[PDB]
Design a protein around this ligand. Sequence first.
Ligand SMILES: C[C@H]1O[C@H](O[C@H]2[C@H](O)[C@@H](O)[C@@H](O[C@@H]3[C@H](O)[C@@H](O)[C@H](O)O[C@@H]3CO)O[C@@H]2CO)[C@H](O)[C@@H](O)[C@H]1N[C@H]1C=C(CO)[C@@H](O)[C@H](O)[C@H]1O
Ligand SMILES: C[C@H]1O[C@H](O[C@H]2[C@H](O)[C@@H](O)[C@@H](O[C@@H]3[C@H](O)[C@@H](O)[C@H](O)O[C@@H]3CO)O[C@@H]2CO)[C@H](O)[C@@H](O)[C@H]1N[C@H]1C=C(CO)[C@@H](O)[C@H](O)[C@H]1O
Lengths: 604, 604
Amino acid sequence: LKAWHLPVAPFIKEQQERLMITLWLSGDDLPPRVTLRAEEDNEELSLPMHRLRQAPHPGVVAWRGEINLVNGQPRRRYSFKLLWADRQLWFTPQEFNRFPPARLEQFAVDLPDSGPQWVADQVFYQIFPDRFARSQSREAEQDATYYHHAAGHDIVRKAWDEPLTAEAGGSTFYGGDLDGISEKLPYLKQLGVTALYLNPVFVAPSVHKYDTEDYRRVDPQFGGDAALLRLRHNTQKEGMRLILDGVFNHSGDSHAWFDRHQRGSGGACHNADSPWRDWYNFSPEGVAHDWLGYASLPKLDYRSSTLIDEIYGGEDSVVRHWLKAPWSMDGWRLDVVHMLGEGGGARNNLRHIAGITQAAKLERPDAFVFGEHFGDARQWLQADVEDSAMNYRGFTFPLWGFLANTDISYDPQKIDAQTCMAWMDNYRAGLSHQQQLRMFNQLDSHATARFKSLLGKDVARLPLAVVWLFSWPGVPCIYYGDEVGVDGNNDPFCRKPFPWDPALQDGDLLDLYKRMSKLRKAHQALRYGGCQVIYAEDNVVVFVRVYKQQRVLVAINRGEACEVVIEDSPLLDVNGWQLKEGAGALHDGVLTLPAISASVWFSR
Amino acid sequence: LKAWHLPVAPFIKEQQERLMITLWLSGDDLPPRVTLRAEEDNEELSLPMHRLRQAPHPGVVAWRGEINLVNGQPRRRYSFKLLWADRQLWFTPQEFNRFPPARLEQFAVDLPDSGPQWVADQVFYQIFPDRFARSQSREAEQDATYYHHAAGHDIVRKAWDEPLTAEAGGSTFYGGDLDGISEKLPYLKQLGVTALYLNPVFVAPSVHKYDTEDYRRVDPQFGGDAALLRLRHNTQKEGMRLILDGVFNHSGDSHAWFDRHQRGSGGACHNADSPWRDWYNFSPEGVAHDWLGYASLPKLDYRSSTLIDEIYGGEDSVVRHWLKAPWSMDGWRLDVVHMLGEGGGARNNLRHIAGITQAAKLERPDAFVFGEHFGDARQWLQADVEDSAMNYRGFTFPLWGFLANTDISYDPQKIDAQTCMAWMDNYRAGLSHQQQLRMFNQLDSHATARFKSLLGKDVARLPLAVVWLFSWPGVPCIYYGDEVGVDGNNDPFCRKPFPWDPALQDGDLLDLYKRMSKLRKAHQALRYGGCQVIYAEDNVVVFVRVYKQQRVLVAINRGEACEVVIEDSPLLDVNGWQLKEGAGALHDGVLTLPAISASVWFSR
Ligand SMILES: C[C@H]1O[C@H](O[C@H]2[C@H](O)[C@@H](O)[C@@H](O[C@@H]3[C@H](O)[C@@H](O)[C@H](O)O[C@@H]3CO)O[C@@H]2CO)[C@H](O)[C@@H](O)[C@H]1N[C@H]1C=C(CO)[C@@H](O)[C@H](O)[C@H]1O
Ligand SMILES: C[C@H]1O[C@H](O[C@H]2[C@H](O)[C@@H](O)[C@@H](O[C@@H]3[C@H](O)[C@@H](O)[C@H](O)O[C@@H]3CO)O[C@@H]2CO)[C@H](O)[C@@H](O)[C@H]1N[C@H]1C=C(CO)[C@@H](O)[C@H](O)[C@H]1O
């Protein structure tokens, strides 16, 4: 028995107040009855399906039923209950199940969809501002050294060509700034970038600036408020989106609310009468607690109602401040989204993350709010407390395992294509189709080793991850310099200054990024399409994006040259295929795949 | 490779502010390193494990690590990361995983546990009051007929021996009352019952009374307030718990807040100025909406702040009213728990169910709050918005499939022991050990066909479900009359009057219930123990409850006589076994199991 269904046209279609659901079956012992098991206000419904007279494809039988859209919540969950005289079988995002699937692992479609629909149309680029580009006209005022109290020494200035070292990793400045990003927008635009995610830019003593000192003012070293306001103008003018790093789990210990180094008068660290005393945790004798290992990053206590108001509760809150005029940013990347909470830990985390996302959409209804999840984000996404997550668990780490033999802990990993796709497909199963389309996918970040370094001897697999990055469901994010071949180990060495000298750039890898963003811009199924893994064994993964009549076929081979027979899939029943990238060859259901390759085909 | 771990002593042990975690491995290619992958404030931690010098059992290697209890939230989630030089493997509640388990499918232990710890010590009995027992001294005033407006005719009185029929299914009264329950407490106590769950008892015109007319007054037909207050006294006196049906998704249309039949003056159905107009949904022209198919059961709209206060928000709320003096009930069974919400559907359902549970524990900290979930309750339980659920998905329906060949929809079901246990074990995987211990397990209810009827030709399998009911993790609930062999199809025919004539009672089945409640009372592992399925194939399931040094082995065979070899399991390495129930025989790792049997062994 075989079955096909994707939560997307041609398999679903909205018409009047109805959502039409089609299932495809094929086999010798087809079920005489199929029931669409859908959910309406969390109640399980048995919706009858009827057999369509016309075969959608040779030897395939189509069933159709419908979900009433006038009732129920927007997230339409369903699966298929295949019924014979004596038995049943479930068809799910994870193929066949012999017992009922988990409610939160069904197919799901958001109708109506209230999420940020612009996200799926984007190509993202992550910039660590100190290390991206120095503006042509920066004051040496922005080059001045000061004493970094939390570190115990003066900050260090380095020149763009000086080697990055482990010493003073948080206090070494190469001087990149926001005007530098503005001036490099034409580079970013010819890369295909339509959206920027910036690491923190607010006033802070370290170079990374997660040690926030002032949530209301841009750090002068980056050019201050005027330079970010210009970056807002320039990106708007170029139709680009701009997301800022939201660091709300914790402040820096130089913030005026805490003020450990007593720059001012009212800080909570050394004053029991401080207005912000209840925004931080203290020992019974009144000594401020460290957060994890960090004196520099005291944790904010969302037990306090006034803290709740300051961050997201009130109209004057930090979360809404940067979303209205004049800043009008497009949303927030939430740092440490999973640990924010009350009493020094993640207590009531889900309530506060929801409160933040809600406050964002009050100020700006199409605001994009997504959180950094090294871990399993499914509970957050399944309760809709945020729009998306940095998809380390659903995308990054499966590719670390399959291509680079490592994982989140940099432990040995040995997983073949079957395991890799069961992993990636199991993660998506917890997400609606509209959620899958906006998952924030990347290969590395400011908080990981460079993916190119993680490949080691297998660095020739890097072009595979690039193609995969642009073709797996979700919005892709390029970590700055990845595209020109920047490498390095984990923090601090993953934050090398961008090599603007072309002699220091992998020009071929950069072109591959350019072509892939063009393909994604060009073809709807790479932005809106369902996704069916078709073959996943040993070294070879083959999947197809599916949107209406269009198909995009992707074949990734991490190992030696081989041939892979694709059994006649009704998803691949098209007029013909046009190869768009890679040197693979499809002919008569046989994929001839060269060693260590990734190929993309468009249906013609 | 083989592994064992249960979230219970001997595998875990609290000592100082530390939780010690032990894993057992056995095989030819053991991992030289194992990492305890635990969670602290949602952050994934790699806690090293070390090899113990002493083998817990022959050919078994023990690893140990520890979770720091001073930090993190009470729910300690973890799994095991087996590490070799070139690869890794995960050990989980669901055996080995090749890619990381879901965060909410790890092992989990609640330390500290704030749940109702008395629940695991109970045997529950569900009573539909009209059909249980008429008190020796009931007024014929309680026998009077009235007109049931929602039905269109007078209620009907029947005698205890009159056959139950489909006519007037909601308006036919056999006259059982609360004093009748009181007078039958000695029967219930010699059955082993320690706790009662009553279907609704508040003033309502139907016989089932989910059409609530007055949340503050007991229906006179059941004996009114004094009869329930006596039932409170009598159960307290006998050390028994008392749970009431909480019907808060919807009221009856005869309630004064709605008042469709205009008994009074201010109802919301026919008065736009009504104080409760915003507690119900109306068409733009102001006509009250039906809920699902029901005019009689208008849905309550938790959008309204004053409704929130009336039900659970205020100190005078319905939820807290019955939990303080003089009522001092032990908690609430929440009817339609999954659909309660705002605007006519389940919008913000999770917030309101949590609000209800919170209000219960304000009034009464060890209150038990659990909801009727025909569906998958995992999201509710995983967010802790309730203590437990009627475990239809985790217990009832797997036993319907494996023993009775049917399911929630009364569709044909054909599932063997492998599928049945993968199903039951997958559900539990989403639940902490303390949550598993308080899942509300039963074989049928007032809302299903009688399980004995569902077995059909295979009714001889009924004793298997009984033994299973008392030995699978969770608190068992007997649906009244099940124990004496009452049968019948779905509602109305599942609510037959209890046969108090012994000539109409299955005396053997009643004794089996008596013995099983005694075993459960006697042996700690049947109330607190972990649970490891040991064998699950074809007709045979074998599992063991595990608590400290004690073991309870259960072997269920739904089919022909057979022998089952139990490979040497270190969980079964004991001095010897004492057979307590059933005619199975264990000798030298070989189970001789007669046709259609269930057997229980205690370790000696
Ligand atoms: C002092 C450090 O500040 C930053 O790191 C913070 C920040 O809030 C965030 O990046 C957080 O990131 C991750 C997730 O929260 C975890 O889920 C994941 O498992 O681990 C991630 C990173 O650990 O981590 C920090 C809060 O826990 C900044 O990004 C870092 O560079 C930090 N390091 C300082 C200090 C050292 C001293 O040796 C230097 O190596 C480094 O270069 C400095 O910048
Ligand atoms: C009118 C009916 O009132 C009661 O049923 C309600 C009640 O709130 C609750 O039992 C609810 O139960 C279930 C769950 O909510 C669902 O998840 C599950 O899938 O379906 C369950 C039962 O349908 O169902 C009702 C709210 O939807 C009372 O228990 C019933 O007896 C009801 N029936 C009346 C009416 C008919 C007319 O033919 C008679 O057959 C019956 O004997 C009457 O009592």
